[PDB]
Design a protein around this ligand. Structure first.
Ligand SMILES: N[C@@H](CCC(=O)O)C(=O)O
Ligand SMILES: N[C@@H](CCC(=O)O)C(=O)O
Ligand SMILES: N[C@@H](CCC(=O)O)C(=O)O
Ligand SMILES: N[C@@H](CCC(=O)O)C(=O)O
Lengths: 414, 415, 414, 415
């Protein structure tokens, strides 16, 4: 008369959590979580008796090669260890053909997860950065031209030789002194020269004012670096390594996806030399955190958004997710339990209690309000590294400067 | 053949479009599009003819208030006006209850679209913008008087008037270099003149500082542009506006959902006035183009990402997909052809023709060059264009002095 | 009552709002008195017809002195012209004298409302602001001393005295030109003088850099700053007049209040010139908007909030609530209706419908919601009025400069 | 008769406090405070004898839900161990059904409480703080090296060393003025020297700009601090924690009210651990005092206004009151004292004796009132202290140069 069933589940942290009294409790009491209280609600509607169990394989597990003999979690259904599965498991025809599935309870998709980027060590020459590259070339050519035009106009028969000191060497010297805003030893006596002298002042005044303003702007609200826009970039580059969780349905999806980017990524991962795949969520997390972002991990975004709130907040989503897929309850073929739980799942889908479960197990567990910069940093003094460049230039210049005197003296040695 | 199957259709690119000269063509040949091809695939695989018909009221339709009447294509299905529905009809519970669907053939999410904001190429002389015309003009007038007074004071009968170099031209040349803080070759000696020098120096000290400060502040403000992202801002931002197509089941979803984000959205849309809703997709996207920044629009991501690649290329997606849905071919309740249709759908799926048709229709029409993809977010770099004008001023200045020196020669050679 | 009642009500937008078709709507269907038809729960139980009736005097009503005449609402209740009032009216013993009350449905208090402040025109001399009076003073004494010390040490006996240009006049000239960062031809050429020269350069360098930095910060962020915040300021009031609603029981409360700050306020409000009070909401509103900078108005915080979200969004709450009191139903003494309606108000408080009663009007009409610092209009060009001071100084100095030459000329006339 | 009625009370300032000589005094004189004073007016109106008694567990108490056994003062009132109680217990319906109350004698508001923000005392040389110690150090060495190289290269024979003025001391004088951008009297002649000059010029041009930019940034970040205001954003801020007294009426209010912001507050108060709850006002205040900046507390505003006026003055109100409440004297149901007590309360209210008590217990007690008035420090201006040290450096510099001339005299005076 009486009847009981065995249930399969998995200790996924968003879905099932190990109760502190884990030493001796039964699976119907050992556990709490979205799967646990979903199962309780299902048994409340359908009335059937059950016991919770972990997946005996403790994993999703891969298909047996060349046979597709099922993994632990599916085999426990097919071979009578269990008759119902309530787990975060991907809906697909390659599974629907062997076992029945309920209506999906959630809709979700693949995402990348990456280490949150951090401030890099500043560049040795980064003191140039505000003013952009090309302008320095324009400045150089302008200085040349200005010196030449000054020299010519100064000496093009002002009525004559020796009438003033403006030699070409001295003309370059005047041109250089006028820029860095320093002592002026001489001045153009002639109108055309005073004219040439004039505009160069306005030009330097504007340039310097712009530079000093912009550098001041730069030091406020840094808001920099964004190394990857989407997996597009990850498909163009090859330095950063990546891979899926092993045995995952992502691997089968890529195995047959005809999209050129995804087909290229698949053929690479098939061709990848090191061990790109990870067996566990913990391994996938640790590998990225170890790699300082040099390796990136693919997972269903609903795990990422759970880990995102579990401090430290050193991980982030990027990209607009990969696809859309359902999660649902599963049932082996011919099992009488199938439709009486499927109708209960339909009830919950239309009654909306799942929104209560989602609130209870994700949104109430949000912690990391640091996303919105809830606390304001304080500026600190410049490090020596932020200006180090100028000292090398200085000392090198002095070193060169000594050499000239010796070579001049050796020329004048006879 | 028993009878030609009555097909309901609505004009929507790329699903269905009018032919270039449709008025010249056969009634079915009048139309072209993704679904028109698929209709031929259905006719092939199931082995019967079909008749294309435009949906009379031009909408999917919804349940009428307080009457439970059905209008739109669904109305035509529930009242037996047609035999099969061929349109990007989304599958939802409140309609599944009365019409039958094949296996889904495509998956989608909802998306948000906005106008591309600007083309901010700086003006040729915009570096002057901190000071405005009047300040420069008054500086110009002020410049003269200082020299004039210096000259007048410098030259008088010492009751020895030759004992100073402050001629008129030198009295100019002193003052310009003084204003630029470049120093001088000579310094005034009379008590009167030093006062003038002092006040002109003070004037300089104020002006140059003010200019530098203002330019710095201006760039500082520009750094904080902080554009809207991820639609989360629409929980709090209200300077923007947004809305949806009318009679779309998007509206039913929004008014039926209770998720606090989307509850807030429906609360806004239920109460904001004047009506943010729109009756047609064509004028809806035009509403964004007309609103030019103030009104955003919500639509299926498939449509957003079709449109945004079209020739004008003046709009873009923002944020990710809000949810997930799918299309299915639909037919009245108990239509015996429905299972043959489901088999045809399954075979066309397995054959990959669902890619074939999409690969024809989407990628060739991707005529926008997709430049300025945002892959280099300014990097705070001060572009050369922003300062270009000064180089023209410099070159012109140098160009003039040649001609000056030439006429100076022509003078010195005959005076 | 004759199985029929005329509910005393007042048209006030936080509680009752006229329907558009008031030319043809009649009875309760002329309005949306959700603020009443819940408390009418006992009217539902008794089944008597209730008409939402406009208070005859259109005002909260009052009680006279001497004659003790009862006005408006109060009059029509005590004279038996009306029978039940659900009007938003203040609980006070002066009314408990002749009528009785239910438990108050909500609590509120005295509030004060002013026109939102605005940026005035810039000050003529406001260009001085970054350094303040003390520093601007001290610079002068520093300049004096530096010149004096230079003159002293430069004219120790060289061995013949006055072997260099550094007279006192020239010393003042040199030190002034050194302050302004200007070309000075003469040089100390002496140890003590060079020492003195150095420090003055370092001093000016620091001063100027500080000034420019601070002004740069000043232009980035603006804050209007409210001129007053407290009742103490209103006791120290300069010109801004203030007053309560006329005929309002807050006025009698102020007449009753003995506490020294409020007694001083009252004795001012007694001794202020006539027309300091206002009789209606609209009169107070217009007076405040007319008072660009001359008057401030006091009202109940719930009405302040109800206005604060309306258009134009040009008013603000200032300060805290001055007191607290309840609003509740009022009825003639010992009424066979007034007794049981308290049961309705009680159990409606247990049901918590007060939250809906608030939300439907105060929060659904939030309208002019949050404004913050996120994005602003371009700072735009600096106006001439922000620097006008310098031009006056300049032209004044030039005008003076000629005078010295004429008097010098007349001195050298013999 | 009257068997020496027992009054229950809990110690709290200014309500009731111990006498400083309670180690040796006896009777009700062992105490001071608002309520124990008012007890004399109660005895005046009742005509009865009474004794003060300390509440054993020292708290108001709670229903103890899932058990429904009252404790605290309410416990003593329901189990008949307390004849009458006088304490700042607020009247609530969940209490009124257990105990009687007089007319309310005083009105209250709930308040938030925080530590004072520490005053930003300037440093004597804080003007240096933008530029870091190592840079200031290394500038000196670079200045030395440049000067030495300029000297050496200038005076090596030109083929004769008398041909130029660049002596060692003159070489030190050139470089200093060049670094300060003050110009100079003389200019280097040889190509090597001009190279050195240009290098040193570029170096200063970089340094001075960097210094100015950093100082401007440093002030800018400061300005926009925007401290917490009205404290309602404790519903939104999370870096700063806030507490509430155990068993207090507030502990019910946040469970029992259902306004959304207070809902998320109660969710915080439920979830946060170490718990927000505290057993005593004294140690909660101590917790705030030690947990400066990061911690806050909820209390009756009347208590904050008592506490914040004490000599330490390190704490203050923030924001407006949360609600409105009152206090009444309490007694078991149907006590024949109740109506006499209500009459006494009414009389004392009408007589204004409430103020005659209150004035002694707050207005003489206030001993901190220093607030910005007449003028305000915070507006924009820099204080003199913020740059003060430079003036000391200047004065000392001028003070030194006298002695140089004095030793120059002491040399020359015996040539
Ligand atoms: N292990 C999950 C997810 C794997 C994946 O993301 O592909 C499943 O196969 O159902
Ligand atoms: N017509 C679709 C929505 C189309 C859209 O919002 O883009 C529906 O029934 O929901
Ligand atoms: N609502 C107040 C009138 C306004 C006032 O007192 O200022 C009353 O019930 O009397
Ligand atoms: N004395 C108040 C304390 C209120 C509180 O702090 O929660 C009471 O009766 O509970």
């Amino acid at each position: 008369e009486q009847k009981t069933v065995v249930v399969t589940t998995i200790l996924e942290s968003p879905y099932v959590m190990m109760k502190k009294n884990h030493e001796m409790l039964e699976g119907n009491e050992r556990y709490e979580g979205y799967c646990v209280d979903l199962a309780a609600e299902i048994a409340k509607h359908c009335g059937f008796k059950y016991k919770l169990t972990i997946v005996g394989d403790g994993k999703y597990g891969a298909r047996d090669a060349d046979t597709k003999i099922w993994n632990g979690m599916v085999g426990e259904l097919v071979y009578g260890k269990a008759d119902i599965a309530i787990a975060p498991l991907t809906i697909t025809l390659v599974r629907e053909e062997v076992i029945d599935f309920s209506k999906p309870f959630m809709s979700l998709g693949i995402s990348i997860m990456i280490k949150k980027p951090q401030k890099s060590k500043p560049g040795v020459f980064s003191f140039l950065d505000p003013l952009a590259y090309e302008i320095w070339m324009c400045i150089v050519f302008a200085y040349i031209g200005v010196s030449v035009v000054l020299f010519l106009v100064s000496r093009f028969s002002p009525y004559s030789e020796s009438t003033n000191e403006f030699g070409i060497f001295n003309s370059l010297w005047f041109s250089l002194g006028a820029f860095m805003q320093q002592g002026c030893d001489i001045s153009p006596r002639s109108l055309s020269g005073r004219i040439v002298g004039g505009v160069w002042w306005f030009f330097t005044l504007i340039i310097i004012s712009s530079y000093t303003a912009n550098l001041a702007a730069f030091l406020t609200v840094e808001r920099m670096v964004s190394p990857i826009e989407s997996a597009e970039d990850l498909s163009k580059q090859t330095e950063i390594a990546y891979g899926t969780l092993d045995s995952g349905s992502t691997k089968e999806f890529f195995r047959r996806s005809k999209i050129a980017v995804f087909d290229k990524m698949w053929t690479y991962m098939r061709s990848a030399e090191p061990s790109v795949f990870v067996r566990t969520t913990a391994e996938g997390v640790a590998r990225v955190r170890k790699s300082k972002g040099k390796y990136a991990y693919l997972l269903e975004s609903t795990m990422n958004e759970y880990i995102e709130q579990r401090k430290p907040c050193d991980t982030m989503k990027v990209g607009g997710n990969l696809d859309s897929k359902g999660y649902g309850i599963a049932t082996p073929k011919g099992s009488s339990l199938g439709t009486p739980v499927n109708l209960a799942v339909l009830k919950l889908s239309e009654q909306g209690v799942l929104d209560k479960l989602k609130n209870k197990w994700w949104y109430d567990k949000g912690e990391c309000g640091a996303k919105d910069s809830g606390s304001k940093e304080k500026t600190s003094a410049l490090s020596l590294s932020n200006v180090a460049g100028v000292f090398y230039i200085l000392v090198g210049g002095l070193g060169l400067a000594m050499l000239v005197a010796l070579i001049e003296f050796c020329y004048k040695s006879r």
